[PDB]
């Protein structure tokens, strides 16, 4: 059973979603390589010495391709516009999807012609990202 | 008919006379001092003629092979006198091969990959393709030299060897020391200074001694394993002065024990560079002057690892490099390197992309198990494809020039380190840190040159040029390190 990983267009990142029992993480869709990128970060968070003290906040730092947590949020933290929601149960997803806005849109996850300059400007062309995440521990 | 031989390449003065069948009649050896040879020879050659009648000997042999300049010409003097004052033929023999032959003659060995480790020199020799060829080789100083030099630094007695083996047996802590592999060759003078400083640092002498061997002999048995495949012999012989070393004997066995190959060591008196040693070879050759660097590979004979698993990760067919642990080496050091190299095969095969040079994508690094997940690029080794597609030699030269521009220095450059799907992906980088030093760059070049000369001597010429064709293209300071490559190549024996 895979993580409910779906992109969302039109986001309303507010106060709310977090400290109310959000047992399900969401990143910024503008700098997520593909659905693979996440699928990697979740596997990396799942099988490496916990760099973050909760699994859901680790996905953020792994996908960030950087050790630091505060700087990780600086580059891949979810923001107004478009996001990549991760959940476990279909209606636990619905709760957060209700709080933020917009349509479920998996096409905002994938790399435009636009990302492959900006994505690798801030990562220093789509699998190279995974190897930054892979070396996160050297 | 039976023959007498004279040994005088280094420090031991050896007179010895052997039969055409294979029995030693006389074998005594007394230990810049060419005078030592010029004064010992008459004494020993007297004691020889007091054991065997002069008339009945038919051949004069003298180790004209690898050795010191004045030491050789003294032996050559005594040899040239004997041959005409007896009216018996002279035969100039190669010193290294002489060690191999009385190994075969004493041990129940027949075609062995021999590790010739002595105070004077250290290298791996096995007869391949009508000549005796050297594979593994010290790039600086012999294991004997390197070990002895450390002893003298600590002010231990003049056969240092034994006492360093003694104190080693009482060590408990494996000190961190520079393990150094340059492709198939070794360097020791690094490890020597390291131990030299470790001693000044405060570490237990008992300790420093243990790890010194642990690093020396582990990197010795390491290259021997490397040869064990390329030469594919069923037997591993150990000649040379330092063949005494119980520990080196221990791990050398251990190693050959895995690949089920046999391991012999010549009975004590025939490892030390000796008279009878070279005396046998001359008459063996039966059935002209000095050459201080007798390049063994130039004789006429007339007596004729870590496993991969293919797997699929996400949406890719990949491989996983399990750095299999070796039982022969110290438990602390064993897992210490296979972590250490995994941490660089990852760090480099990745960093390599940063200056546009193909290598597999690494999806996972697992230092706990010493395994690494990298994309399976379909194997077509540059080695196998270099004949018909000579064009491949171009990019290999190119992508090395990228590295030398960025101070990234691989240390194991070989044609089997590259494959072909469309470009030339390096499927290996295990050992090779970053170094600004100009001599480094030059050393890595000759490492590959020797590698092509090793396995591709059949079509080497006009392809070390095809290497440069790419290497000249990329790196600008190319004439800078190749000119210095001449300076480090002139590290031959002292003409």
From Swiss-Prot, chain A:
Domain of life: Archaea
SUPFAM superfamilies hit by this protein: PF0523-like
Coiled-coil stretches noted in the UniProt entry, renumbered to this chain: none
Gene3D superfamilies linked: CGI121/TPRKB (3.30.2380.10)
Annotated phenotype, changing residue 134 to R: Severely affects Bud32 binding and does not stimulate Bud32 kinase activity
Outcome following mutation: residue 130 to E: No effect on Bud32 binding
Effect of residue 130 to E: Severely affects Bud32 binding and does not stimulate Bud32 kinase activity
Job of this protein: Component of the KEOPS complex that is probably involved in the transfer of the threonylcarbamoyl moiety of threonylcarbamoyl-AMP (TC-AMP) to the N6 group of A37, a step in the formation of a threonylcarbamoyl group on adenosine at position 37 (t(6)A37) in tRNAs that read codons beginning with adenine. Cgi121 stimulates Bud32 kinase activity via an activation of Bud32 autophosphorylation.
Subunit field text: Component of the KEOPS complex that consists of Kae1, Bud32, Cgi121 and Pcc1; the whole complex dimerizes.
Similarity section: Belongs to the CGI121/TPRKB family.
Protein name per Swiss-Prot or TrEMBL: Regulatory protein Cgi121
Source organism per UniProt: Methanocaldococcus jannaschii (strain ATCC 43067 / DSM 2661 / JAL-1 / JCM 10045 / NBRC 100440)
From Swiss-Prot, chain B:
InterPro entries given in the database record: ATPase_NBD, Bud32, Gcp-like_dom, KAE1/TsaD, Kae1_archaea_euk, Kinase-like_dom_sf, Peptidase_M22_CS, Prot_kinase_dom
Free-text remark on how the cofactor is bound: Binds 1 Fe(2+) ion per subunit.
Lineage: superkingdom: Archaea
Annotated binding of L-threonylcarbamoyladenylate, by residue: 116-120, 148, 161, 165, 245
GO biological process terms, semicolon-separated: tRNA threonylcarbamoyladenosine modification
A Pfam cross-reference name: TsaD
Classification via CDD domains: ASKHA_NBD_Kae1_arch_bac
Coiled-coil parts of chain: none
Record key words, sorted: Acyltransferase, ATP-binding, Cytoplasm, Iron, Kinase, Metal-binding, Multifunctional enzyme, Nucleotide-binding, Serine/threonine-protein kinase, Transferase, tRNA processing
Matching Gene3D superfamilies: 3.30.420.40, Phosphorylase Kinase, domain 1 (3.30.200.20), Transferase(Phosphotransferase) domain 1 (1.10.510.10)
Main location group: cytoplasm
Activity control mechanisms: Activity provided by the Kae1 region seems to be regulated via phosphorylation by the protein kinase Bud32, which is itself activated by Cgi121.
Cofactor section: Fe(2+)
Residues given in the record as Fe cation binding sites: 95, 99, 116, 273
Enzyme class label: transferase
Its EC number(s): 2.3.1.234, 2.7.11.1
GO CC list: cytoplasm; EKC/KEOPS complex
Catalytic activity: L-seryl-[protein] + ATP = O-phospho-L-seryl-[protein] + ADP + H(+); L-threonyl-[protein] + ATP = O-phospho-L-threonyl-[protein] + ADP + H(+); L-threonylcarbamoyladenylate + adenosine(37) in tRNA = N(6)-L-threonylcarbamoyladenosine(37) in tRNA + AMP + H(+)
Family stated for the protein in its record: In the N-terminal section; belongs to the KAE1 / TsaD family. In the C-terminal section; belongs to the protein kinase superfamily. Tyr protein kinase family. BUD32 subfamily.
Function recorded in the entry: Required for the formation of a threonylcarbamoyl group on adenosine at position 37 (t(6)A37) in tRNAs that read codons beginning with adenine. Is a component of the KEOPS complex that is probably involved in the transfer of the threonylcarbamoyl moiety of threonylcarbamoyl-AMP (TC-AMP) to the N6 group of A37. The Kae1 domain likely plays a direct catalytic role in this reaction. The Bud32 domain probably displays kinase activity that regulates Kae1 function. In vitro, exhibits low ATPase activity, but does not bind DNA and does not have endonuclease activity.
Protein name, UniProt field: Probable bifunctional tRNA threonylcarbamoyladenosine biosynthesis protein
Organism: Methanocaldococcus jannaschii (strain ATCC 43067 / DSM 2661 / JAL-1 / JCM 10045 / NBRC 100440)
